[PDB]
């Protein structure tokens, strides 16, 4: 469409960011992002105002539970075939939607490139 | 697609931002953005690392030249039917393409919402 700076309806922005395991062979990304019992990624979302979730091959870490669930074919576990990644979604007023997503990308970069 | 944080090939991002003339009845937006013979929007681009251009009904300010060019139907003047807007385009490495466009949006907000 067009972007209207004074629009009351929010636009969405979405990104699937690969988790660079190739580049960090011994780094437990998945662990770090999620945290002691769900609490990190919880505050990460609270802090960014975005929806962030980890998805794809290796996201439960547990090759079995993933094979079971994949093979179960429940649609919700669809993502389990995909490369491991972080799925960032914002829903924001046009005047700030880019700000939101960029902030969110920053915060997430901190995890995915941890020696930045 | 997917977003790769360690990718050498740049992604593009584009936005068409309406210039809110209804909201600022007596404000010469077009003038301000372009400047003394082209120099503002020139630095704006230099500073953001983005491609920024003003387009649509009123972007020359000159009802005649616009009628002539519209009716001339040269494809380049296509935009002359559209609402007046700023067209922001970035071409950037994935790890910072969002940063770039958000910065650029901010800089442009500065012009389009001038009393903010």
DSSP letters, B36-63, are: GGGHHHHHHHHHHTSEEEEESTTSS--H
CA–CA separation, A91 and A13 (whole Å): 7
Whether B6 is covered by a domain: the verdict is: no
Method used to determine the 3D structure: X-ray
CATH number for B93: 3.30.1370.10
CA B28 to centroid of chain Cα atoms: 16
Whether B77 is covered by a domain: the verdict is: yes
CA A102 to centroid of chain Cα atoms: 13
Beta strands in A3-59 (DSSP E): 11-18, 51-55
Among residues A89, A40, A24, A30, which one has the least CA distance to residue B5? Answer: A24
CA–CA separation, A43 and A49 (whole Å): 10
How near does any CA of chain A get to the CA of B17, in Å? Answer: 5
Q: Tell me which of B3, B15, B107 to substitute to probe the interface with A (most A C-beta atoms closer than 10 Å).
A: B3
If one counts the domains in chain A, the total is: 1
Taking the Cβ of residue A93 and every Cβ of chain B, the question of whether any pair is shorter than 8 Å is answered with no
Whether B56 is covered by a domain: the verdict is: yes
Rg of chain B (C-alpha set): 16
Whether A6 is covered by a domain: the verdict is: no
Whether A61 is covered by a domain: the verdict is: yes
Whether B5 is covered by a domain: the verdict is: no
Whether B2 is covered by a domain: the verdict is: no
Among residues B51, B108, B70, which one has the least CA distance to residue A3? Answer: B108
**Domain that residue B99 falls in:** 11-112
- HSE-up of A110 (CA within 13 Å, CB side)? 13
Among residues B54, B62, B56, which one has the least CA distance to residue B34? Answer: B54
Looking at the partner chain, which of A6, A18, A95 has a beta carbon nearest the beta carbon of B5?
A18
CA–CA separation, B54 and B47 (whole Å): 17
After what residues is chain B interrupted, C–N > 2.5 A? none
CA–CA separation, B79 and B56 (whole Å): 5
Whether A2 is covered by a domain: the verdict is: no
How near does any CA of chain A get to the CA of B21, in Å? Answer: 11
Across the beta sheet with B11-18, what order do the strands follow?
B11-18, B85-92, B51-55
Taking the Cβ of residue A81 and every Cβ of chain B, the question of whether any pair is shorter than 8 Å is answered with no
Axis crossing angle, helix B39-48 with helix B94-112, rounded to the nearest 10: 150
Resolution in units of Å: 3.3
Beta-bridged to residue B15, according to DSSP, are: B88
CA B13 to centroid of chain Cα atoms: 12
Q: With contact defined as beta carbons under 8 Å apart, do A2 and B85 qualify? A: yes
Among residues A54, A47, A49, A48, which one has the least CA distance to residue A31? Answer: A54
């Amino acid at each position: 469409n067009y972007l209207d700076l004074f629009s009351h309806k929010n636009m969405k922005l979405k990104e699937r960011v690969l988790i660079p395991v190739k580049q960090y062979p011994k780094f437990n990304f998945v662990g770090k992002i999620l945290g002691p019992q769900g609490n990190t990624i919880k505050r990460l979302q609270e802090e960014t105002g975005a929806k962030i979730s980890v998805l794809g091959k290796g996201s439960m870490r547990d090759k079995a539970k993933e094979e079971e669930l994949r093979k179960g074919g429940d649609p919700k576990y669809a993502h389990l075939n995909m490369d491991l990644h972080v799925f960032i979604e914002v829903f924001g007023p046009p005047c700030e939607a880019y700000a939101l997503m960029a902030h969110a990308m920053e915060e997430v970069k901190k995890f995915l490139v941890p020696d930045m």
